[PDB]
Amino acid sequence: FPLPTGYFDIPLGLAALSLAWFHLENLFPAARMVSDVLGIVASAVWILFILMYAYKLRYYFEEVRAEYHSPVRFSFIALIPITTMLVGDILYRWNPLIAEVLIWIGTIGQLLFSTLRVSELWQGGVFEQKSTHPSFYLPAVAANFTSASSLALLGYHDLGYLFFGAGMIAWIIFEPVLLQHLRISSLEPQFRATMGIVLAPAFVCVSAYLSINHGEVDTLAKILWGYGFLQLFFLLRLFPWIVEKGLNIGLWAFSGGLASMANSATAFYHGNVLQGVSIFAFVFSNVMIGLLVLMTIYKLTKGQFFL
Amino acid sequence: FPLPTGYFDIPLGLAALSLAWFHLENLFPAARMVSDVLGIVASAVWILFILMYAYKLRYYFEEVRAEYHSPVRFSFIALIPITTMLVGDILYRWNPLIAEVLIWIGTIGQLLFSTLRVSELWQGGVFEQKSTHPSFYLPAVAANFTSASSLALLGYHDLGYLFFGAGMIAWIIFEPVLLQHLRISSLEPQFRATMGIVLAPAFVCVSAYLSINHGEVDTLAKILWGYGFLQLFFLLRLFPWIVEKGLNIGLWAFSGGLASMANSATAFYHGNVLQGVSIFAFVFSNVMIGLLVLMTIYKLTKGQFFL
Amino acid sequence: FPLPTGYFDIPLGLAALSLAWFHLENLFPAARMVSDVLGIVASAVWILFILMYAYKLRYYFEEVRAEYHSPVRFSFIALIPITTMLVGDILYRWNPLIAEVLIWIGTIGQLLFSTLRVSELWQGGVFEQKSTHPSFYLPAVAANFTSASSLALLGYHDLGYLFFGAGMIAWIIFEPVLLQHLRISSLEPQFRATMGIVLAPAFVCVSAYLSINHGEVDTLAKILWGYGFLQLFFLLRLFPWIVEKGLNIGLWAFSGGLASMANSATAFYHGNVLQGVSIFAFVFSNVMIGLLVLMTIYKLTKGQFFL
């Protein structure tokens, strides 16, 4: 099937950057235009990708079956509901009713998804030590942070805090065994682009947190940013090793983290906290996601995108 | 010996539900009656069980010796001081002086217990990977949350926060390796009823927290509830697997978690936060502990309770 | 080479105790004298030790090379920048300009150090399960807490909170796998003195936190203290096992934790919170670091300090 599930990272990353620029509108009006263009690109890619995936469910169902049951690959499916909610969040600026349908479909879906599949891992005997990949953050952690921000947007803040709490504690509970496994075993080259997901948790956390708490940059938020930057420096240093066997579309896995860096940076800028670190983060993230776009345009014009 | 240490889960669960109903008195006066009846049942079962256990110490001491030294079974002993404190908490409504004796005996006991036994595990060579069971939450985590709430009740809030902090950080520090071990190895049928303890931490946490912080439902509390509900959904889905080889009195291990669900729910209802989720949680927990009571009455009348 | 890297624990511990006494000046003026004497001793030992280590870099460079690459021994190098910052903090009372040079050198150094070396562990294949030692807290956790407090002192509170957050979350993320490894494997006698580092995190955490947050003893701070005392009781009980094969200069590894116990205790005393527990902690820590000094004076006069 020509569409790898992982490619939902593309509208994921583009949609989150849209939302990041959106929060700048009231400081710099031209940011709205930029926010709108990214949101439209992201929504169109999401529509294309949802229709391709429906095509897969219908005619390549065994391949979805097998990725669903894999203790490793099941995770990427969580990107479907996540981008669904993020597109819904973009659309809210134009049609709050369609946005809310999309947000609930995505929230119910991810919750149902993790309850069915993540819990089942606890029966033992299928997940193995080498199953301890960064992609596990998706169903467990990123899905919940996205429901939390998206439900806040619709005015459900208390409900938002529940899903936030689920994401935050799930993250702290998984990372310990992940980092220990990387230390000991690490990852073979073909999985290494997924190290980009390791960037995500702190930054997606604080961005979701600031969405629910009215943009108030407090101690918790500063604390998350600190640890976010620590992981960024580590990943920067690791980058040559990560792309040891070459650059590839898998690198879109950094995009959710990078985009949350941009988003959180806008909140910090608004609240007048580390404004310089903010400008740096926002510009850095944008340039990098920009490089991902240029490399994806390159591959599209060398017939090397789809399978 | 006819009394398994695990059976202290019974007055544990009944006592915590008593305390849960107690907090409803000022919204609905008939809740006091219900709180009192459960507290009396719980206290009577606790007296019976304490006298049976003293009997074991005296005439079956090798069996206590061996459970004490087991890296797995030592944990259930922590239920003795825990229920001791909870009974003390019930009794406070009638006799604050006896309640405080019981609360200090239970606090000193659990602290002394964990300091002697839990620390010793760090000498290595006795605890094994397959020793990573949910029952380890008892000495480490539940004991401390119970001291914290119980010491708050007597007016020692700052002292309460120390034990709370010990419980909360101990929990976050153990769960990561527990969940990883369940993923990989899981648990054989005879230990599976102890999955019910996994429900407990978030809910016992927030309940203890609300006891110390004057019932103020804040961000931390909402965060804990979110993760509590995530684990509930997982455990619900896992339930058929949990009771694969049949229903049994071991299922009383859910009761501390269920009861803390009820207790925290009353605090949330009072503070006007997610009142509907609150009614659901309170009713759910009560029905389930109610089912545990009916199944225990059933077994008592088939001579299948004691050994 | 006559100086083991670990011996930087000596000025580390002495410098942190200096800072602890410093905070008592405004309650009890004679504490300044005591603070100054310790700070001078600590600074002189630090100068001696820095010059010995420069000597090692220059003429014994292969030995630094090999300790740098060890997945276990690399950690102790982090003590160089840590004590550098702490000496800088002492000196601030006399010369704020030299203090700030030292603080930035130490912050840039530790950050650069961890980014180069700690991240590299994630390439796998060098760090092993038996590499899971308490010394790993140094580069990861203690280095960051020291930058955070030291940058607060110079007036950079928001920057302080970033490094604090990095330390705090790094700690919670490592301890889980550490404690599990001690439970299963523990440590051979020659590494056991490093159990003293396990005392450090909660107490260094809360001390750094109180430095940044203006000494305000809040819920988070009480929570950290609770868990700090839990680990203290465990370590007390473990002590005979720790010194099974004899007392040795390695025991200076407790000194950062003990000194942070003293420091945090002063903040708690000021804010009128658990003042009695505070007096106990302050006196306890001082007596113990005092015993370490007497045993070090003893060994110095038996020619059994340097190699």
Ligand SMILES: CCCCCCCCO[C@@H]1O[C@H](CO)[C@@H](O)[C@H](O)[C@H]1O
């Ligand atoms: C979007 C992701 C879709 C998930 C596809 C799920 C595969 C379901 O799993 C299957 O379903 C059958 C019953 O329905 C089972 O009995 C099969 O044994 C099992 O393979």
Ligand SMILES: CCCCCCCCO[C@@H]1O[C@H](CO)[C@@H](O)[C@H](O)[C@H]1O
């Ligand atoms: C894309 C997000 C929505 C979730 C869709 C997945 C539906 C799961 O499918 C389920 O797979 C199970 C195994 O866990 C089967 O046993 C069940 O019959 C089936 O309901």
Ligand SMILES: CCCCCCCCO[C@@H]1O[C@H](CO)[C@@H](O)[C@H](O)[C@H]1O
């Ligand atoms: C695991 C990481 C969790 C870090 C805990 C967050 C610290 C909470 O910070 C708190 O909230 C307010 C925010 O300005 C402060 O006023 C409070 O005094 C402080 O306790």
Ligand SMILES: CCCCCCCCO[C@@H]1O[C@H](CO)[C@@H](O)[C@H](O)[C@H]1O
């Ligand atoms: C998330 C960070 C993005 C916000 C970027 C805006 C940077 C604008 O730059 C700032 O403009 C100010 C006035 O508007 C000037 O006075 C500042 O000195 C200048 O740095």
Ligand SMILES: CCCCCCCCO[C@@H]1O[C@H](CO)[C@@H](O)[C@H](O)[C@H]1O
């Ligand atoms: C309520 C739980 C009671 C715990 C029973 C503890 C068993 C103690 O342990 C024992 O104690 C002896 C000394 O007292 C030791 O020397 C024995 O070796 C050891 O087995």
Ligand SMILES: CCCCCCCCO[C@@H]1O[C@H](CO)[C@@H](O)[C@H](O)[C@H]1O
């Ligand atoms: C029920 C809660 C109270 C705690 C009672 C347990 C007392 C522990 O018993 C102890 O066992 C040790 C091993 O750890 C022995 O070495 C000690 O001699 C003994 O004091």
Ligand SMILES: CCCCCCCCO[C@@H]1O[C@H](CO)[C@@H](O)[C@H](O)[C@H]1O
């Ligand atoms: C590991 C899980 C810890 C979650 C951290 C709790 C977040 C603390 O929440 C804090 O406390 C107050 C409560 O309303 C808020 O005002 C503060 O602004 C916020 O920082």
Ligand SMILES: CCCCCCCCO[C@@H]1O[C@H](CO)[C@@H](O)[C@H](O)[C@H]1O
């Ligand atoms: C922990 C939750 C338990 C509290 C349960 C009480 C539910 C009562 O029900 C509520 O009564 C209100 C008035 O008292 C009505 O006005 C509400 O609409 C009704 O929902």
Ligand SMILES: CCCCCCCCO[C@@H]1O[C@H](CO)[C@@H](O)[C@H](O)[C@H]1O
């Ligand atoms: C204060 C601690 C100093 C760290 C000493 C670092 C050892 C560096 O590591 C080395 O550096 C060379 C290049 O510079 C490498 O190519 C060598 O392979 C590698 O051994």
Ligand SMILES: CCCCCCCCO[C@@H]1O[C@H](CO)[C@@H](O)[C@H](O)[C@H]1O
């Ligand atoms: C004492 C704190 C300051 C940090 C000094 C250490 C400098 C690291 O040295 C580095 O070692 C690398 C391997 O990780 C080599 O590959 C690099 O060439 C070298 O830059």
Ligand SMILES: CCCCCCCCO[C@@H]1O[C@H](CO)[C@@H](O)[C@H](O)[C@H]1O
């Ligand atoms: C992992 C351990 C983290 C513990 C979380 C800290 C709890 C934060 O405590 C918070 O900050 C203020 C401090 O007085 C309170 O007012 C807030 O109401 C409370 O949420």
Ligand SMILES: CCCCCCCCO[C@@H]1O[C@H](CO)[C@@H](O)[C@H](O)[C@H]1O
């Ligand atoms: C970190 C704790 C160190 C502070 C130690 C000072 C202890 C002094 O002691 C206190 O002095 C008070 C007046 O100053 C008396 O009134 C108190 O009762 C007495 O306990």
